[PDB]
Design a binder for this molecule. Structure first.
Ligand code: HEM
Ligand code: KR
Ligand code: KR
Ligand code: KR
Ligand code: KR
Length: 148
């Protein structure tokens, strides 16, 4: 595909500082959907404000976990069927923590935001379209974890 190379090339810049970049992604996510904040319950406590999440080692570790799953989809961009079972179970896990499948749409917008902001003029509409398709295929696999 041309799209596989566009994904690989765009990811390279972002993937070298995944926490910095994932921090943009989550900052955007909470600005768009503040109701996601309480779902991160570590030692049974709720973050009051988005800035609270950024001082939590566990929350920051979760950002790294996200960027690593994205990294695995990039590695497997030419066939995501090989991550499908892992992703379905990732979905079931998120269902169990309280995340609504519809919130993954906001996550997708946040990812695209973070890419746009990091790549600037290099985030061509083909690059946008490629990532939208890759993320959509990830979410399709994850959705199996909600049943349907
Ligand atoms: C609305 C979005 C999300 C929320 C509220 C959320 C919340 C959580 C929570 C509470 C956990 C369990 C505690 C933890 O390990 O830190 C978790 C685990 C995890 N999440 Fe997320 N998450 C979201 C999106 C994502 C996305 C998009 C990915 C990957 C692309 C991701 C990857 C993971 C991984 C890899 C784990 C470890 C799961 C395991 O135990 O095997 N999460 N998430
Ligand atoms: Kr954040
Ligand atoms: Kr994501
Ligand atoms: Kr996306
Ligand atoms: Kr992705």
């Amino acid at each position: 595909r041309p799209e596989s190379e566009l994904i690989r090339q765009s990811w390279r810049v972002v993937s070298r500082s995944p926490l910095e970049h994932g921090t943009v992604l989550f900052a955007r996510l909470f600005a768009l959907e503040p109701s996601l904040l309480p779902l991160f319950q570590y030692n049974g406590r709720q973050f009051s404000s988005p800035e609270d999440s950024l001082s939590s080692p566990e929350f920051l570790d979760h950002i790294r976990k996200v960027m690593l799953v994205i990294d695995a989809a990039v590695t497997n961009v030419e066939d995501l069927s090989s991550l499908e079972e892992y992703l379905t179970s990732l979905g079931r896990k998120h269902r169990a923590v309280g995340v609504r499948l519809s919130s993954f749409s906001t996550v997708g917008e946040s990812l695209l935001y973070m890419l746009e902001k990091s790549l600037g003029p290099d985030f061509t509409p083909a690059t946008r379209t490629a990532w939208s398709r890759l993320y959509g295929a990830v979410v399709q696999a994850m959705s199996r974890g909600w049943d349907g």
